[PDB]
Amino acid sequence: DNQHKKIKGYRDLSQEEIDMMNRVKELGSQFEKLIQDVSDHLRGQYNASLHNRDEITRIANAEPGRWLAIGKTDIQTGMMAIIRAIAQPDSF
Amino acid sequence: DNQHKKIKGYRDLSQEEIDMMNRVKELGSQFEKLIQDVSDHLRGQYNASLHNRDEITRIANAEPGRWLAIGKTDIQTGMMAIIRAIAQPDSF
Amino acid sequence: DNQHKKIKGYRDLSQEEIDMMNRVKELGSQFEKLIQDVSDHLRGQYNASLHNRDEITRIANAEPGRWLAIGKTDIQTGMMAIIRAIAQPDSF
Amino acid sequence: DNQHKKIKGYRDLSQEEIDMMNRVKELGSQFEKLIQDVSDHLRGQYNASLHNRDEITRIANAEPGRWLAIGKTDIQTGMMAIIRAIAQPDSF
Amino acid sequence: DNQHKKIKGYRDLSQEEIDMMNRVKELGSQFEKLIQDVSDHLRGQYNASLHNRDEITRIANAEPGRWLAIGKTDIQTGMMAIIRAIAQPDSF
Amino acid sequence: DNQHKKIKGYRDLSQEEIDMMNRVKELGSQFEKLIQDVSDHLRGQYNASLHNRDEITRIANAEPGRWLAIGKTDIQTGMMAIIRAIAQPDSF
């Protein structure tokens, strides 16, 4: 009960701050959907290019799944940074 | 004219790929609006806490504007990574 | 009251998870002290090298305050990542 | 012998600078221990939640091992940035 | 045809800007070669240290392939940032 | 004298490893030159667009100097990661 009071640096948040944080998280939800769509596109592209050594080598050299993972991580950590700017913890 | 053909590694893009890229960029637009809103909130919070040395010191110690900048950069570079996964350049 | 229940993706945490999170944050406190010490060292180094154009140019070219800021940000975001691994939010 | 004189940009370091660098590295050691502890916790959590499809899916969706790896990398690169601020190499 | 006009925020580029971008990309090519060389060195080091449990454990603990991957990603995203500074898109 | 033996985790390096590290650093030197060139281009672009409120606002909105700084930091930390993969320190 009231676990946030037990975590160092966590202060009480107004409803306004909570709403802004939840807004960040909902925009992140939309980004989650978009990333899933891109991953599906990559599956389909690779599949359709099966037994096309040149196209398969092109895709493998571009490393699109690795770049999608990088982008996902950047989106999530940017979300976390914005939420930190809103919530403003009391600790380093 | 057709400048993309003059840049190393840039290949021709299908309309599908262009649409996915533009989708990433529009979601980024919404994030731009959200970040502007958070910055306005920070302006108002600081202003309202003028001549409240304790609250001013708290805000300054939390560094919310620096964290908002960090989050903005992360969102933008994640956008760039996702767009790279879609467009798949031909170069390192 | 119980603000964590109002934030999307935040689940109830056991006392064990809270303790691990607080541990991350206390180690971060020690890092805060170390970074303050390094910043003091940089102040003193610059001051002692006043009116020594060569040493001043060397320091300015090395950009140690910018690198200290980079390191601080990395430590803080790594702390945030570890705390996320512990708390395991329910959202993207 | 004296390999640091053979590496571009590496200058001679005072004992004070070496001590500060070693301090950064020892704090990093403590972080290494903490990360090992968190990884053990994750092993135990997953194991205890074996044959609990809902809890297993929750953990898998949270990706805590990936976030622990992200945090480890951030801690290490922040350490490297702080050590660079101390040692101040002579090269880009 | 003229796909860049269909992507949000992409403006027309002068030949000067295109040349600077291509310069960034060619320097990146040289970095690609250097990273391949380092990876070959790591293969050879590991191979030569086969059936030397101590050296194998040392290498595994240092995680040099993971650090090479980190460095590759940093080089590529720095390239992307510089190219963005040159091309200056019109969108967030 | 032999300061590297006094820093935790630093092992003795072969001449091969030193040469690879110095190679990374020389490529970084070339990147330093390229970044200086881009910064000069940005100075000239801004200057030439003086008293052209529209072009000045465009440049300011694109934030090219901030993106150049981001790219510089990424190049430098990628260099550091590659050099770490080569030198392979003995510490976290």
Ligand SMILES: Nc1nc2c(ncn2[C@@H]2O[C@@H]3COP(=O)(O)O[C@H]4[C@@H](O)[C@H](n5cnc6c(N)ncnc65)O[C@@H]4COP(=O)(O)O[C@H]3[C@H]2O)c(=O)[nH]1
């Ligand atoms: N005004 C303008 N800006 C441009 C243009 N092309 C790129 N940019 C900018 O520079 C970045 C490109 O960096 P990059 O070449 O290292 O990575 C690019 C490149 O790898 C890929 N890409 C872009 N256009 C492509 C294309 N036409 N074909 C193939 N891949 C392409 O998408 C990546 C991310 O694009 P982005 O829109 O997020 O960032 C742009 C964008 O901010 C351009 O034509 N005009």
Ligand SMILES: Nc1nc2c(ncn2[C@@H]2O[C@@H]3COP(=O)(O)O[C@H]4[C@@H](O)[C@H](n5cnc6c(N)ncnc65)O[C@@H]4COP(=O)(O)O[C@H]3[C@H]2O)c(=O)[nH]1
């Ligand atoms: N003052 C204050 N600041 C808070 C509070 N909750 C979060 N913050 C701050 O914003 C960050 C949360 O960002 P996030 O929601 O994107 O990631 C959070 C979230 O994914 C997770 N987490 C935090 N509280 C949780 C909880 N109660 N349940 C589940 N997961 C939780 O831990 C991550 C990192 O926490 P952190 O302490 O390093 O950074 C906080 C912290 O700096 C809060 O209640 N009060």
Ligand SMILES: Nc1nc2c(ncn2[C@@H]2O[C@@H]3COP(=O)(O)O[C@H]4[C@@H](O)[C@H](n5cnc6c(N)ncnc65)O[C@@H]4COP(=O)(O)O[C@H]3[C@H]2O)c(=O)[nH]1
């Ligand atoms: N002037 C000066 N600067 C130094 C010296 N040693 C390191 N630095 C600087 O601090 C960084 C070292 O941080 P680190 O100890 O966390 O990571 C180091 C360390 O993990 C590894 N390394 C460096 N010298 C080593 C060595 N002698 N043996 C083994 N590993 C070594 O290389 C990493 C990256 O080196 P770098 O040259 O890119 O950055 C240096 C460099 O900018 C040094 O002797 N003199």
